Amino acid sequence: SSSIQRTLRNLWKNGFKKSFKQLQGYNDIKSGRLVGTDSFGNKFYEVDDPVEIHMRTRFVEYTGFWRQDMSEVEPGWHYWLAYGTDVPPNQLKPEEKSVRAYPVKKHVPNLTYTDGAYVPYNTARPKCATWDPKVTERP
Amino acid sequence: IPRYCYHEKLAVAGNCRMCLVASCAMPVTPKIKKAREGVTEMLLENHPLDCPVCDQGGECDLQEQSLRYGSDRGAVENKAIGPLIKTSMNRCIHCTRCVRFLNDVAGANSELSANVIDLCPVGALTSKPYAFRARPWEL
Amino acid sequence: SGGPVPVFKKYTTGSKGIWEKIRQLLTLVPNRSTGNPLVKNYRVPPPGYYDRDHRRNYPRLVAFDQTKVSGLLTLGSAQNPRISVGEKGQKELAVFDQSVSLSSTLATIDPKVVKSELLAEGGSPVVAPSLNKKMKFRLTEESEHGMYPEDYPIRIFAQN
Amino acid sequence: KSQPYDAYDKVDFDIAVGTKGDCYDRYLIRMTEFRQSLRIIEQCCNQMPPGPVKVEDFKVAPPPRALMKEDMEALIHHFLLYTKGYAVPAGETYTAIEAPKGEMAVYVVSDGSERPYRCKIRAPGFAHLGAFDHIARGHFLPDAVAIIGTMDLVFGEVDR
Amino acid sequence: TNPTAFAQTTRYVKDSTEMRTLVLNLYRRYLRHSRGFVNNYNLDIPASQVRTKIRQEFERQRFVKDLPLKNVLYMKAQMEFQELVNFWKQQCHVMQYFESIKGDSFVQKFLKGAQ
Amino acid sequence: VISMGSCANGGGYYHYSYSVVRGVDRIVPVDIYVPGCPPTSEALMYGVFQLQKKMMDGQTHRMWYRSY
Amino acid sequence: TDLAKELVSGAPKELITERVARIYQETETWKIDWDILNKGNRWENDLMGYQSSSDYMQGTILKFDTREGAIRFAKGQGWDYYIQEP
Amino acid sequence: KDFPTTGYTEVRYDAEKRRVVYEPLELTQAWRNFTVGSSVWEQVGDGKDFTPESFKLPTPAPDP
Amino acid sequence: PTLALTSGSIQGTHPEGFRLPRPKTWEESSESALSKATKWYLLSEIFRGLYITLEMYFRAPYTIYYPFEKGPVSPRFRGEHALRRYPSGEERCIACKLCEAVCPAQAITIEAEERIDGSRRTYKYDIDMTKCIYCGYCQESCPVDAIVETPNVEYATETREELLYNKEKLLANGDKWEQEIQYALDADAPYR
Amino acid sequence: STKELTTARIKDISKPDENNLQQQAPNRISPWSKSQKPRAEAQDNVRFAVKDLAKQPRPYAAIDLIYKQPIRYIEHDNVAVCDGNGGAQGHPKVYINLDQNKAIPCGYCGLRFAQAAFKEDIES
Ligand SMILES: CCCCCCCCCCCC(=O)OC[C@H](COP(=O)(O)OCC[N+](C)(C)C)OC(=O)CCCCCCCCCCC
Ligand code: SF4
Ligand code: SF4
Ligand code: SF4
Ligand code: SF4
Ligand code: SF4
Ligand code: FES
């Protein structure tokens, strides 16, 4: 798993363009079978290489080239990447697939350090209402 | 000595059978423990599974006497009696405490008719303005 | 016993072909596994009433002051009675309804009674009772426990 | 061994005992316990019995969810367990176990309610650190590092 | 084992005359170490002000009558002394000790919500 | 400064204790807060990666040129 | 009995000078709680609506087995107290 | 038992003083007392006696 | 007849051979002087330790490349909280306040009333994530499975305010993570 | 108008525009509870001065979604049984009486059950 034969073998499979991207973020040239792609654009791969060690059989390719944020991974594939399930969310049974009664928009990553960061607030009204003053003529 | 139908401010009843040694009506052990378990199951035979959504939850006499003197293993339409008492008769344990107050003390639509919420040991009759707003351990 | 086990009988990833022979040639202890879990065997399937009311039959906390302890040496016990009968019986027990010093009781009583109840085994002192009477130990040897030989400054104790 | 608890009486293991009472003796003892635990782990894996894992009492343990949503008595016990807890009869206890650091014990006082009246936690590292001045006198500054590490001091346990 | 520096063994004094001498001896030790307190804790006040502060605390308990309260007060005063001399207190705690200090009228408190 | 875990963030289990600071940000400025009791190693690494992302957005020398 | 144990307790002076305690039998034990502050007992947090407080005795409820114990303890601490007769 | 669980004072760093200082306690969310849900009934009974017969007082015999 | 006659005990008896034997002298060794000096001067055991270390240099390391790879997770994992809906879009929580009472850290604040349509619903559900101990008691106590912890762990924030989750934030997490929540519930269903 | 944004009503009087960030929910304009703070008043704070309102969490209102489900109808029975449509992962099972001539919602789900013989009256 640390030999140069594995690296050269994976370098030949991916090509220069894909391997140079792995040489910039991944720190490791790796190859695998495309398993799916989430709604954010990440590509998820699985490795059949017999020399890969236990926890390294699944990996992600991020959309960016210089920065990679783990929160960009869609929740469907977040569980699969962590070996939570052997069924990728693009192979789910009709019964096992969640049913939503609201529209589903594009995956939004963690918004901290941006203007979109979550702002907490009290969702309840004031517990007492002040009297609205009304004046009546004195008889 | 457990009870559901005993209250010294009202007339004597023997329609709950939880005071066996009915000691409430009668003037002055494993069988008794078994008897209390047997009576407790009868009340819970038809009782709806409403404790999470029921206002008597933390202050329910049926709950406490099911825990204390019972085993741990085991459809009536509502009515309207005014905007002050919320009626869910599915939970009634048929103890006739409401009848004794409404006819003997109240004399009835009354200025005291809201006291039946106190006497009803279960969530059959509950305060309507108070509904769903608090739990007795919060107060 | 937990003697040495060959490397191929351990659920790790080893060597193959010419590289296994080389590994056996250059390892001081060649039967030691590499420690890397097997991919094809390890974690392949991913994880994704009153009769029994013993709490309410709890033992009751009962204390023994000098008054009741004196009563046992004087009046005996319910298992080994030494008490009178009738109205005489109730006269003697009502003596221990108020303060009765045990040191005063120990002054005037037959030692044949003290050595039978207060002490044990005919005057033998009462020894601190053990929490587990099955606690025994025995020294063993390296051919048994498999740990360090005798020249190391520790020893191994078995159940005995 | 002294006060067995929770299926330690149904397994086999040996205790390593030193003779010189220094840091090297305790290192060997802790290395033996490594192998004695692995001996127990194998036995438990081969002797795990079937049956319930929690006490069959819904006044202490939560009922299953499937039973909670169909049985009225299960729903009451689930409601009461999570809103009041369970009452514990009044009393007190001093229960000790063989914690990896040493003897860890708790002195719990119950007032008959669903909250503990008093809970004193006896920390093995608290007593070990109270003997450090007696042990470390004479030794040099690098030896204090060894003495600290041979006591297995986790200060959350010490301070709590 | 050995006790830390400036440690005294705890003893329950049963004589008011003997208690009075022990208090006066300790009061002298506070005054003598006053210049040390200014040095170690880097205070912004002269040692003369420190000695004045010490006297005020001793003057607060001047008229305590009960002997059992005297022993507990004396024991706690010894612990504080051992704490200050050995530099166990952090400098922030000693600085705030000298940070300690006209009450408003009824209307003044009424306007701001009082206490 | 990275604040890790519920104790350092806001006190956590010991929030209502007489001897606990209810958040390390009462004493020192905090740049990122990592949640969890404890945060996993990956949760901490993610927090570090967020800080490294913010550090790569620093404009200290262009601040001198364009803001001073 | 008459010892000023508040001098060596370590509690602040306001328990003796300002705060007032109540002794009551609520139905088998006697309890001691403190009367609320006129101001500062509660105030709504503007951020998340939490109930803020500056009353450090708000959650303290002493328990006693007899009426004599509750009164004796309160006097021993120099507390200003009133007994709520049952 | 009379010492409140949150104490009386709290620390914070004072920018003007350049140091950490103690201040009287104030809580953004006061501690909530759910303990008031103490059962109006007793749960455990009177228990079962396990005193050894060798330590119980003897009983007088009936009349001859 | 016990050992109580001599104040003895069964536990007091040391086993046979408990007393340490006589310590050896210089003449009672098994190795010659040159044998012990060759292991000493030539550092026999030190060189062996180096060789063992050099063996590890040729083995596969354990390191995984986070965030491109993730460590294993289980359906019982406790992470970021989220409120859940029924498939129809209705909230599961009936504002029953069970999770508020259980919560060991008192990190949950609930205010409830009657909805306009008449349902027992909450209008205020806050979890202080800087106070929670991620202990799962709220999830275990919920009778409708409304409150859950998702396997998410990567939600670190710049400010401490962002860790004050209100009902809108918690419901948004439930919508975001509903599919991953479904994985854990289905797998962990038999054991709950 | 500021009235449909700060008052609690049974039904919205106008069409909910999901791009309007002043609405209580993307699908509902007015708050659905009397103690619920209007979303317009909540966002008028110092902490929202330089924040992007579009990215703030805005879950859809459950009150609007639950009532778009069709009324369930029972044939040849007077009692409706509901258990969350999930069994062990639904809600506790309850029995709903259908004597009255109206649709009675479930105590947990909110699904409104009715008798088929009462269909025409309820649809009116
Ligand atoms: C060639 C130049 C490099 C190495 C030079 C020094 C090597 C050690 C010499 C003293 C040996 C000695 O004293 O031997 C004493 C011992 C063994 O003897 P025992 O305990 O009685 O054996 C017990 C009975 N048997 C004989 C049946 C086994 O041997 C050793 O532990 C040998 C360890 C060498 C393995 C590691 C080799 C690589 C080391 C790193 C090199 C960079
Ligand atoms: S009346 Fe009591 S037992 Fe029945 S649902 Fe309500 S709380 Fe539960
Ligand atoms: S409605 Fe309430 S008070 Fe009346 S009989 Fe039923 S349980 Fe008793
Ligand atoms: S793991 Fe939890 S209790 Fe421990 S230090 Fe971290 S936040 Fe505190
Ligand atoms: S996980 Fe535990 S501490 Fe966290 S909110 Fe739930 S009950 Fe409270
Ligand atoms: S336990 Fe579940 S239903 Fe009850 S208040 Fe909490 S989230 Fe809502
Ligand atoms: S209390 Fe006597 S039968 Fe009801």
Ligand SMILES: [K+]
């Ligand atoms: K009621």
Ligand SMILES: [Zn+2]
């Ligand atoms: Zn339903």
